[PDB]
Write a protein that binds this ligand. Sequence first.
Ligand SMILES: O=c1ccn([C@@H]2O[C@H](CO)[C@@H](OP(=O)(O)O)[C@@H]2O)c(=O)[nH]1
Length: 124
Amino acid sequence: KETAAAKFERQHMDSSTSAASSSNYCNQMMKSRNLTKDRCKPVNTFVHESLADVQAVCSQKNVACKNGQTNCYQSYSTMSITDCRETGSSKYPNCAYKTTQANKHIIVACEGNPYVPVHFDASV
Ligand SMILES: O=c1ccn([C@@H]2O[C@H](CO)[C@@H](OP(=O)(O)O)[C@@H]2O)c(=O)[nH]1
């Protein structure tokens, strides 16, 4: 198994590096986190901040989620993140990604007790 919260950490947390250096970050990280084993996950964002900092977003700016649900939250401060987007030549199982580093406000969906992140919605 795997809790929804655990999956969020596996799919979106990377407190080890301050920023994605070198264009090969995503190719390695996406495979490393098992995001390309069943297929190539199209888009995925990694957050380069402490777990406490990201978890704290669940008590920050309440905003509507893209699917219409009301349990999304936007970080007050910008955060260091890395977007991974699959390229065109990308063909399973050899998934290929474009690595994009940036500093933006993240938006995550939270749920449960404790109230923690379970989905990365967007960055703005
Ligand atoms: O900026 C973006 C946009 C999308 N996704 C990712 O694409 C996913 C698939 O619907 C979702 O993963 P998740 O729901 O397991 O977090 C997330 O919205 C990101 O990780 N970052």
